[PDB]
Amino acid sequence: GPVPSRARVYTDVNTHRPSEYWDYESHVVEWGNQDDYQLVRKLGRGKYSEVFEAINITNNEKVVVKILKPVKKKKIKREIKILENLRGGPNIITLADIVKDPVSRTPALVFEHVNNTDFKQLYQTLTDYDIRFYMYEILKALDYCHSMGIMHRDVKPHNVMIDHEHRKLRLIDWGLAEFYHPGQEYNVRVASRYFKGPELLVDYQMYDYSLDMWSLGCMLASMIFRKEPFFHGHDNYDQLVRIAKVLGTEDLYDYIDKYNIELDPRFNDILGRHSRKRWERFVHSENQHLVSPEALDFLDKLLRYDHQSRLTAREAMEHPYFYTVV
Numbered sequence: 001g002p003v004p005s006r007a008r009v010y011t012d013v014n015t016h017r018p019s020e021y022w023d024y025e026s027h028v029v030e031w032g033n034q035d036d037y038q039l040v041r042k043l044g045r046g047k048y049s050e051v052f053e054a055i056n057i058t059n060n061e062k063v064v065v066k067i068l069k070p071v072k073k074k075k076i077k078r079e080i081k082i083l084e085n086l087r088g089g090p091n092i093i094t095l096a097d098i099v100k101d102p103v104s105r106t107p108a109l110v111f112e113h114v115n116n117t118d119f120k121q122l123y124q125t126l127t128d129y130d131i132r133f134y135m136y137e138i139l140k141a142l143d144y145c146h147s148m149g150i151m152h153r154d155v156k157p158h159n160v161m162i163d164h165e166h167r168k169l170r171l172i173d174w175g176l177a178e179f180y181h182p183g184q185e186y187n188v189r190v191a192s193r194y195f196k197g198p199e200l201l202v203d204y205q206m207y208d209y210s211l212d213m214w215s216l217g218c219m220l221a222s223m224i225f226r227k228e229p230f231f232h233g234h235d236n237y238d239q240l241v242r243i244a245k246v247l248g249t250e251d252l253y254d255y256i257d258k259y260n261i262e263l264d265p266r267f268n269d270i271l272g273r274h275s276r277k278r279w280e281r282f283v284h285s286e287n288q289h290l291v292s293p294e295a296l297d298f299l300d301k302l303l304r305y306d307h308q309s310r311l312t313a314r315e316a317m318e319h320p321y322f323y324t325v326v
């Protein structure tokens with residue numbers, strides 16, 4: 001069968017902690033008052049959620065209310081426990097309350113308000129420095145949650161809120177987040193298609209925090225190259241082919257050989273043969289002002305098939321690409 005794997009960092013953080021920290025099914029939820037909050041407007045719509053801007057009428061402070069379609073109670077408890085565990089961590093969205101609607105029998109999470117600036121207008125005003133600045137803020141969030149034994153598993157631009165006026169960044173939507181336990185086999189149906197790590201696509205279940213580092217690499221490539229998304233798969237199988245068109249098929253076979261992975265038969269007629277591309281091939285007139293040798297070197301160390309060969313969040317923070325940031 002497949003060769004086992006474990007995280008190179010924070011491997012045993014949950015092993016050395018008591019069950020109260022990671023056994024989310026045993027966590028006791030305590031509701032606040034739904035009457036403290038007045039809904040203002042709809043911000044977005046998720047698979048099993050609706051996000052609203054609200055006002056806490058007891059202090060006249062704006063908040064964010066995430067109403068959850070309670071399709072799986074276990075999943076709601078997981079998200080609540082993780083949010084409670086990470087509360088106060090750098091650039092982590094702050095869970096301020098948990099409320100219930102008794103008539104519809106619906107739970108809601110109340111968060112600190114983040115004034116998100118428009119992402120489409122944020123493009124082409126962003127400089128090389130801004131990308132390095134905001135990439136560093138995301139790394140602080142990831143190094144923190146990984147150090148807390150938690151994998152986000154849904155890193156993408158939709159899950160990163162930026163208040164550009166105050167240079168404030170928050171990593172949000174911890175609904176797919178999970179406790180890392182060495183040796184555990186996780187569900188590969190996590191992250192959004194374009195941000196899915198090769199481990200998920202080849203059905204390698206013993207993954208870790210390094211999955212978030214791949215997703216972060218997809219975001220960096222799309223920002224510096226002005227190509228959204230960077231890896232444009234039309235399905236989960238085609239997503240690996242899009243990756244293989246860049247990283248090449250040679251290294252892909254080295255990765256599946258190292259972990260003794262069996263490729264799904266669906267990859268037989270679509271994978272083909274692809275040479276390893278130079279990152280400099282993606283440089284064009286519209287993006288060259290955001291690209292540098294240090295950005296390319298950093299990108300090359302995140303976008304690796306081998307999850308163990310990717311920079312951890314702390315190693316990434318020490319990369320020359322971030323020498324210009326505080």
Ligand SMILES: NCCCCNCc1ccc(-c2ccccc2)c(Cl)c1
Pocket residue numbers: 034035036037038039065067068099100101106107108
């Ligand atoms: N006269 C009472 C004024 C406050 C009314 N409360 C508004 C309110 C009602 C329900 C909810 C709610 C909706 C879905 C799930 C969980 C909670 C909220 Cl956030 C707010």
Ligand SMILES: NCCCCNCc1ccc(-c2ccccc2)c(Cl)c1
Pocket residue numbers: 044116118119122130131132134135156157158159160161162219220223
């Ligand atoms: N679901 C709420 C919508 C949030 C939109 N996110 C805006 C955003 C803007 C820029 C970025 C960004 C900045 C620097 C480097 C890479 C990415 C992100 Cl992650 C996110």
